[PDB]
Design an enzyme around this catalytic site. Structure first.
Site, PDB file in Angstrom:
ATOM      1  N   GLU A  80       0.899  -1.141  -0.075  1.00 22.78           N
ATOM      2  CA  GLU A  80       0.075   0.003   0.270  1.00 22.78           C
ATOM      3  C   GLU A  80       0.889   1.174  -0.114  1.00 22.78           C
ATOM      4  OE1 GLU A  80      -3.299  -0.467  -0.648  1.00 22.78           O
ATOM      5  OE2 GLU A  80      -3.209  -2.245  -0.405  1.00 22.78           O
ATOM      6  N   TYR A 240      -8.947 -17.627 -20.334  1.00 20.77           N
ATOM      7  CA  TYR A 240      -9.149 -18.159 -18.733  1.00 20.77           C
ATOM      8  C   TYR A 240      -8.690 -19.766 -18.835  1.00 20.77           C
ATOM      9  CZ  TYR A 240     -10.608 -13.986 -16.397  1.00 20.77           C
ATOM     10  OH  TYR A 240     -10.677 -12.742 -15.527  1.00 20.77           O
TER      11      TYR A 240
HETATM   12  N1  LIG Z   1     -12.104 -11.104  -9.704  1.00 21.17           N
HETATM   13  C1  LIG Z   1     -11.586 -12.392 -10.263  1.00 21.17           C
HETATM   14  O1  LIG Z   1     -11.621 -12.646 -11.806  1.00 21.17           O
HETATM   15  C2  LIG Z   1     -11.441 -13.177  -9.372  1.00 21.17           C
HETATM   16  C3  LIG Z   1     -12.145 -14.288  -9.049  1.00 21.17           C
HETATM   17  C4  LIG Z   1     -11.740 -15.253  -8.241  1.00 21.17           C
HETATM   18  C5  LIG Z   1     -10.412 -15.368  -7.581  1.00 21.17           C
HETATM   19  N2  LIG Z   1      -9.541 -14.410  -8.208  1.00 21.17           N
HETATM   20  C6  LIG Z   1      -8.218 -14.334  -7.708  1.00 21.17           C
HETATM   21  O2  LIG Z   1      -8.194 -13.680  -6.169  1.00 21.17           O
HETATM   22  C7  LIG Z   1      -6.759 -13.319  -5.991  1.00 21.17           C
HETATM   23  C8  LIG Z   1      -6.828 -11.826  -5.115  1.00 21.17           C
HETATM   24  O3  LIG Z   1      -8.063 -11.545  -5.828  1.00 21.17           O
HETATM   25  P1  LIG Z   1      -8.495  -9.989  -4.909  1.00 21.17           P
HETATM   26  O4  LIG Z   1     -10.104 -10.012  -5.027  1.00 21.17           O
HETATM   27  O5  LIG Z   1      -7.864 -10.121  -3.514  1.00 21.17           O
HETATM   28  O6  LIG Z   1      -7.814  -8.784  -5.858  1.00 21.17           O
HETATM   29  P2  LIG Z   1      -7.648  -7.319  -5.420  1.00 21.17           P
HETATM   30  O7  LIG Z   1      -7.051  -6.209  -6.417  1.00 21.17           O
HETATM   31  O8  LIG Z   1      -8.844  -6.623  -4.849  1.00 21.17           O
HETATM   32  O9  LIG Z   1      -6.416  -7.472  -4.048  1.00 21.17           O
HETATM   33  C9  LIG Z   1      -5.309  -7.991  -4.325  1.00 21.17           C
HETATM   34  C10 LIG Z   1      -4.338  -7.790  -2.975  1.00 21.17           C
HETATM   35  O10 LIG Z   1      -3.057  -7.973  -3.768  1.00 21.17           O
HETATM   36  C11 LIG Z   1      -2.329  -6.753  -2.603  1.00 21.17           C
HETATM   37  N3  LIG Z   1      -1.080  -6.274  -3.478  1.00 21.17           N
HETATM   38  C12 LIG Z   1      -1.057  -5.923  -5.032  1.00 21.17           C
HETATM   39  N4  LIG Z   1       0.663  -6.282  -5.064  1.00 21.17           N
HETATM   40  C13 LIG Z   1       1.047  -6.612  -3.935  1.00 21.17           C
HETATM   41  C14 LIG Z   1       2.312  -6.994  -3.873  1.00 21.17           C
HETATM   42  N5  LIG Z   1       3.064  -7.317  -4.785  1.00 21.17           N
HETATM   43  N6  LIG Z   1       2.687  -7.259  -2.643  1.00 21.17           N
HETATM   44  C15 LIG Z   1       1.936  -7.234  -1.347  1.00 21.17           C
HETATM   45  N7  LIG Z   1       0.543  -7.040  -1.513  1.00 21.17           N
HETATM   46  C16 LIG Z   1       0.104  -6.515  -2.945  1.00 21.17           C
HETATM   47  C17 LIG Z   1      -3.360  -5.679  -2.399  1.00 21.17           C
HETATM   48  O11 LIG Z   1      -3.087  -4.809  -1.460  1.00 21.17           O
HETATM   49  C18 LIG Z   1      -4.466  -6.503  -2.252  1.00 21.17           C
HETATM   50  O12 LIG Z   1      -4.728  -6.923  -0.850  1.00 21.17           O
HETATM   51  C19 LIG Z   1      -5.991 -13.196  -7.325  1.00 21.17           C
HETATM   52  O13 LIG Z   1      -4.900 -14.103  -7.652  1.00 21.17           O
HETATM   53  C20 LIG Z   1      -7.037 -13.577  -8.472  1.00 21.17           C
HETATM   54  O14 LIG Z   1      -6.650 -14.494  -9.380  1.00 21.17           O
HETATM   55  C21 LIG Z   1      -9.967 -13.348  -8.999  1.00 21.17           C
END
Ligand SMILES: NC(=O)c1ccc[n+]([C@@H]2O[C@H](COP(=O)([O-])OP(=O)(O)OC[C@H]3O[C@@H](n4cnc5c(N)ncnc54)[C@H](O)[C@@H]3O)[C@@H](O)[C@H]2O)c1
EC number: 1.3.1.44
Length: 399
Positions: A80, A240
């Protein structure tokens, strides 16, 4: 200062501090209502849990439910950018402030290590932090969505792409605010871009987190660890399943087998969750149109669940259930997208997408709901927040 949505190139720059705080609080009340004693007892509960990617989306709900549903100690880790007095921070910086405040009030242990989770310096910061408090981990939640990854060994920075293999994937997209029905496409990815996306989106790093915590003796007997993933509908299979996100996804679940094989005292799963609005959605074909049509159908049917509603179900009906078992599918994966991909929903969404055009967009797909989800991720359009009110500072939340 009146803080309102500044959305440029379908990406939201600013963040509303009180709106982020109310968001986490609304997700907290939900957890309390949903995880009752009639659900929490007769089964085990998480005692200590590391949540990698804690600050929003699936990460934030995983951590919220763990602490407020199952009264657990939580260590978060996220990347963050903090606020100044005058400079807005990333939505996550406010969400994590909101999480600590409400977890202090209830007398729970929570520390959120701010910084790059791909790095070794951070892995170190939590290695010492779990040791300093003693007790070891019983749930590791890998929830990192990042477009970029600096390798700890080589030192190379890796970009990621969202592209197909062989032939251009082309299809409709819908700008959620204007309602304009356009035509964007993703063009075939070469071989440099393909390995770079596996370097980033795959389970390469998640494996590192488990190995390092295992040699430090920071995992309990039969510890659950899960990484999130997404399969999607038959429309976006070109991205996907047989695409470049597709290959990276296949590496993640290959890592989940390699982890059970090399350490039988841990139990690793990849959880396949439902689709929802994220920063990727806008510039990726037929995902906004799909998701906007999907909410319309799933609202009508009453099986639309957002982030918190998804994860509460996960904990309660997959991991920590009376029966003890973890229901998985054929290829050994947790399935929470089970409602999304149920056929009467899928058939209905497909019908809806074919009969949407340049003007009926707002009319017959849920663009309004899609807007709300997209804005609520940044503290905007949250109910009970009056947005006309001035904003004191950008480095604290209050109330
Ligand atoms: N929306 C979708 O298509 C979907 C659906 C199901 C699962 N997912 C999977 O869920 C997982 C997470 O999704 P989400 O909803 O939390 O996305 P999000 O973007 O809302 O949150 C991602 C998290 O990564 C953190 N952040 C980004 N880079 C970082 C880093 N380099 N080091 C430490 N923190 C970092 C952010 O602070 C956040 O907490 C992903 O791997 C995604 O593939 C996505």
């Amino acid at each position: 200062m009146i803080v309102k949505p500044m959305v440029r190139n379908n990406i939201c720059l600013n963040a509303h501090p009180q709106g982020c705080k109310k968001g986490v609080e609304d997700q907290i009340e939900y957890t309390k209502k949903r995880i009752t004693a009639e659900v929490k007892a007769g089964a085990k509960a998480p005692k200590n849990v590391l949540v990698l990617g804690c600050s929003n989306g699936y990460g934030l709900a995983s951590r919220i439910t763990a602490a407020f549903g199952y009264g657990a100690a939580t260590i978060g880790v996220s990347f963050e950018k903090a606020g100044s007095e005058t400079k807005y921070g990333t939505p996550g910086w406010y969400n994590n402030l909101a999480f600590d405040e409400a977890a202090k009030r209830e007398g729970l242990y929570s520390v959120t290590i701010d910084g790059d989770a791909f790095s070794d310096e951070i892995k170190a910061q939590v290695i010492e932090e779990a040791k300093k408090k003693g007790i070891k981990f019983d749930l590791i939640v890998y929830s990192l969505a990042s477009p970029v990854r600096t390798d700890p060994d080589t030192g190379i920075m890796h970009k990621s792409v969202l592209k197909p293999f062989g032939k251009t994937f082309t299809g409709k997209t819908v700008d959620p605010f204007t309602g304009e029905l356009k035509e964007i496409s993703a063009e075939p990815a070469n071989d440099e871009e393909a390995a770079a996306t596996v370097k980033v989106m795959g389970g390469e790093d998640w494996e590192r987190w488990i190995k390092q915590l295992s040699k430090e003796g920071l995992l309990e007997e039969g510890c659950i660890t899960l990484a999130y993933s997404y399969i999607g509908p038959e429309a976006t299979q070109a991205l996907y399943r047989k695409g470049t996100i597709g290959k990276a996804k296949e590496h993640l679940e290959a890592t989940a087998h390699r982890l059970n094989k090399e350490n039988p005292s841990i139990r690793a799963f990849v959880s396949v969750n439902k689709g929802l609005v994220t920063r990727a959605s806008a510039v990726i074909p037929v995902i906004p149109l799909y998701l906007a049509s999907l909410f319309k159908v799933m609202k009508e049917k009453g099986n639309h669940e957002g982030c918190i509603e998804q994860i509460t179900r996960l904990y309660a009906e997959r991991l920590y259930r009376k029966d003890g078992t973890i229901p998985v599918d054929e290829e050994n994966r947790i399935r929470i997208d089970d409602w999304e991909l149920e056929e009467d929903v899928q058939k209905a969404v497909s019908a809806l997408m074919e009969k949407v055009t340049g003007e009926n967009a707002e009319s017959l797909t849920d663009l309004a709901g899609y807007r709300h989800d997209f804005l609520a991720s940044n503290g905007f359009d949250v109910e009970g927040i009056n947005y006309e009110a001035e904003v004191e500072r950008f480095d604290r939340i209050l109330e």
